[PDB]
Structures are given as structure tokens and as C-alpha cells.
Amino acid sequence: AGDTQEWLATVTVEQLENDPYPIFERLRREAPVAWIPAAHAWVASTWEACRTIADDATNFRGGTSPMHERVLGTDHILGAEGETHQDLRAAVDPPLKPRAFRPLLEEQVRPTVRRYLEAIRGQGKAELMADYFEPISVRCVGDVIGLTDVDSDTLRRWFHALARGIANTAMDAEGRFTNPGGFAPADEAGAEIREVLEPLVAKLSAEPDGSALSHYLHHGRPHGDPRTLEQLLPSLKVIILGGLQEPGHQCAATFLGLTTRPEQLKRVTEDATLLPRALTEGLRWMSPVFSASSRLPLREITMGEATMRPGQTVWLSYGSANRDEAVFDRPDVFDLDRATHPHLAFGTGRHLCSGSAYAPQVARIALEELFTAFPSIRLDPAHEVPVWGWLFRGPQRLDVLWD
Template structure:
């Protein structure tokens, strides 16, 4: 079935959806998709969308039929090969490059010493002010600084790291195509191009040093691990995955922290309980990841052979975007899914994906989020929402609050 045939057969409510509508609020559209078209071709994106938990999980776990793939906008942003869009031995090699430092046992060995001083430093910078936008002053800075220091980018300021991930995000989510399948907004990739060029300029000298003087930073290990004696990994096999990390892995803990706070503010009793008992923070984070998944709809798979999902026949080569944020609102698994409720019956979410391409940094991201919120709630236990400011969530590929204005008595 070619693109024109698919467009002809597509209902108007699907054919007319725009990227801007999805960025502002994807939930109503995806709720209808889950009910009427769990797997559907979306002309604005030029690919299929899987919106139910059942469809997303079936595709993610079936490595025989589905291979790792990155959306066209993602491929344009990151380049090839990256850990998201390769399969087989090539995927195994890149996962062996990035996984060791992110395994739970490894993370447990360093995460407290790495993250807690960072979180403490940022909360101390705002505690005497009585008010702050927590996204800009705490959640995102803690997130980017933690990953930046793990990678070995201590020389790069937190502001610059935030700038890089925002620019890469603009490029990655510039997914709209016209009726011919061409980019609707080619200029939308300019911020990502600028960020990538700057990242290379900054990181190349660091790689030069690590080639001769390896240390315990993650990027040093990426250069050396699994390589023959005296050899280092080619940089063109490092940079595309580094760009993936500097977007997805940098935004994820920060957005999860912000969404957890925003969710708790909708349920004051649960918020007070978490403040009084920090052991409840993990539970709140888990519900937040379901409620507003940071990686909302940014992972794709490509069919290796003809197949059928949710009653839809998909020929080999079909690309399907797995919408985890939609799957985590599937009413078949969750009662009142739009409500934040950390007391709901525990049903595993898929905010970090499933199968061989599941997120490598699941445990690290969760621990960064936990430690950050522990420090924030302990230092400012009387934190409350500034009701004079709206909480606007944004994003279809990656989603979280744009701002989170809080106030407290000093």
C-alpha cells in the first residue's frame, strides 16, 4: 500500500491532525486512536502509530519480526549508527559500549556520591529565595549535571548541557512531512545541527586526551571497552549514540522529577504523605512515569517481514512509532488513567520500553530522580505550587512541564 492509498483510506480526524496539536496535548487524539485505530497511519508523520499498551508491548518484545529503527527526524538529528536504530551484532556492540556503567549494580556503586552533592548544591541555591521555576533552577540542572559528570563532561556548564538537549529536542521532534513525504519545516533541524557541531568541538579534545589517558568516565570507557589492545573505538561510532544520550538521557530524569511534583500537586494528601515519608518517593516516581511518560512517543520499530498487529496488515519495511505515553493511559490496564494516583493498583508501565531496545538508563534515571526529590523535599518541606502560574506540559516525542513555579516560606 503506497502513501497515496493510505492517505485516501485515512479518516479525516487522523488525516488532519497536526504536529502542533500533538505537541500541545496528544491525549485526546490518542484516546480516540486506542479505541478506534490502535495501529494507524498518521499522514502528518509519514508512519504508523501504535497507541495501545498491548500493541506497543507486542511490537517491542518481538525481536524476530521487528527491528530497532529511529524515526526519520531522529535519524536526521543523531546520524548512524546509533544505539536506537541498529540491530543484531551492531546493536549488541553499542549496548556493550553503553550498558556497563548503567547496570543497577554499577549505578548503586556511584550514584549517591555522584548525584546527591549535585542535587544539594542546586537546592541550596534556591532555598532562601522563597520562589522558583523548579524546571529551570532544579529539575533540569540536576538531570543534565548528573549525566554530564557521569559521561566525563565536567568542563561543560549545566546551562550549555541544557541548551544542547533543548536544541536536539527541537530537531528530533521536527517530524512533520508534507503530502510528498518531504520535510514540512527543513529549518527546524538547524538548532540540532548547531548543537551537534558544538558538541563535537567540545568533546573531540576530551576524546584526544582519553585515548592516551583513560579514566573512569563513561566516554573514556566508550572509547576503550571491547577494543583490541592499543586500539580505540572509531569516533563515528560514538558520536551518534552520544547525541542520543545528550537528548533522551539528559531530559528524562529532569522531566520525570518535574512531572512527579506536578502530579503530587494534583493530590495534596499524597503530596503530604511523600513529604512526611521519603520512602514513598519511589512510588510517586513510578506513577509519574506512567502519568506523563518523559519519552512519550519517540521510539520506533521497523517490520522485518509482513505482519499483522491489532488487525492491521503491515508489509515488510513498515515503520511504527511506539507511543509509550499513550500506552500508559490505556484504560484496559488503568482506571482513570489521566488521574495521578500513587495508590492505584500496581500494573507495570512501559515508560522505558520493553524488549531488546528497552532504555539502557532506566535504573540510573530513576535513581537521579529519587535522589533529586529527596534533597528537594527534605530541604524545602513546605514547598507548594504557585497558583498564579499555569503548569503547561509540552511535547509529543518527549513530554514534561515547560515551567513549574513553586513558592515556600523562608
């Protein structure tokens, strides 16, 4: 145990961001829950540590951190419990259920996908993150969470700024931020978000219209007691971050994973019915919310060498859990035909991702149209694919060619 602690003292936030897999491989073997001094927080790395802490509503509550409070606000849906959590879920869940979104797939999602597809067609090359996956993700999600009138460039800037803020976790032994300037993008985005949402909230609070934000304010509420801006805003920032970022990362991770398996990529491009399985494997293989899910202990609780205390962040590395050798065979490989087993990329239990049904449908349509249009698509050998992050993880660029 002493060897493990000595090694953990050497781990930096930079190493976690740039080379997480060997770190989590060792943690799964030696410390299922471990204190990371560089991040002033615990991290759970095995499947069972993540699942147990995620699910156990008696000993753990929804997570938060000083980054969540700075970037999102204090009382966000991730941290909420009891009636407050059920009220926030009542606000945000209904539009994300299949009964609600099913018509929008062909009426809205596919036309949006095809608009971005048409813009890259004929080039024989693209950088799929900025040119395709991110605009699709932010537009298809933004259009269903009240942000139809925010352009894709702004939505992408917002999610990147908020995600950078959450990732700004370097802290000294006393828990003080060593890079407070890394919050400047999130502060700027937060002010812009509030300036967009505040007038809409004020208008729709008094004159509801059936739109997404109107439902967030009024659904499940007495007439005359709608939710207020501050009751919703931290949770809306949760969604602006992850709702907008994660689907593009699912697409990118699945695309990248497929390229590592040439025969599987070929099979998928010619049989779109395999896309749901590919997309599920993409989430397992490079979980977009790799470790940014979290819980807080409600009482002192010990797992192994980790004695966690109230108020301390326990990050759940679902991405490591999804790479756990005790659960999956050769988890480091993308395998379209992997033996069936659930994954934790959407979490589990009462905080299970509200978007877990909608996101795989956006990603399916995005990849269907891409592979139909460009069956010869491939990575450009003149570029490398930079992958980054341990809290939120995904490819930063996907330079491709096609014939």
C-alpha cells in the same frame, strides 16, 4: 474504519504536541496502530501494540526516522540490532548498573542536588525546570557520560536542541520536511558536541584513563581496535538528548502529578520512603519518552488496518500505552497508591532503557532534598503549568511557592 481515517487526516503535529491525550484515547479504541499523515509515520497506541512491536525482534528492528538521521546520525543505538547493538550496549551499559553507580549517589548525586537546592533556598519561589530539575538532571547524568567539563547551561541547550530536532516531524504526503529550519538548533548543538567530544576521543583512544568515554572506546574491544568516533557519536547523541532530558521530566511529572493529589503530596513530603512509588507513577502518568521510541518493520506486516512496510517509522506511544484503560483503572489520574502493574516508560525487550536503574535514583534524591527543604511547596496560582509534546512530553515550567 473509514471514519477513523477521515479523522486522522485532520490531525496536525501541532494538535499532537499541544493536546495529545484525546487523540491517543481515540486511537486506543479505534486504531491500535495508525498512520498519522501529518507525521508521515505510524504510531502504536495500546499497551499490546506497543509491547508486541517493541519486543518482536524478528519482525521489527530498532527504530529511526529522517529526524533521527539528521539530529543523531544514521547508526545509533536505538536502531541497532545483533552484534552492533550488543557492542554499543557493552559500551554504555556498565556505568549505568547499580554496582557501578551506587557509590556515586551519596558522593556525587546528593551534593549536586544540594548545590542547586541551596541556590533557590530563601527565595520562597522558583521555576523548578530551569532552576532545579534540569540542572540536576544534566549535571548528574552529564558527569557520568564524559561531559563533566560541559556546563549545565550548555548541556540544557544541547538536549533541548536535539529534542526539538526529533520533534520536527511535520512532513508532507511525500515525506518531505515542511519546517527544515527547525533543525538549526540541532545542527548548532551537533557541531558543538563534536567539538567537545572529538579531542577527548582522540586523546582517550591512545591513552585510556578509566573515565566514562575511555570505557566507551575501549570496553569489550581488543587492544588496538577501540571504537571510533563515528561508531559512537550517534549513540552519544541519543544519550545527550534523553539521558539529559528525561530525568528532569520524570522529576517534573512526578512533582506535578503529586500536586493534583493534595493528600498524597503531603504524605510523600513527610515520608520519603514513598518517593520510589511516586516516581514510578509519575513515569506512567506522563511518560517522558511519550512516543519518541520507535521500531521499523523488517517485512510487510499488518496490524488491524495498518499494513506497515520496511523503512517506515513506527512510533511507540508508550505514554498512551501507560494510559490504556484496558490495563489501568482511570489511567488519566495520578495515584500514588495505584494497583501495582508495570509500565512501558523505559520500554521493554532488548532495547529497554540502559538508564532504567540510574534515572529513578537521581530523581529520588532530587525530590527527597526538595521536599525536606520545602515541605510547604506548592504551585504558584499566578502561573499555569504549560505541558508540551507528544514525542518527548513534559512540563515546560513549574512555578512554585513555599513558606
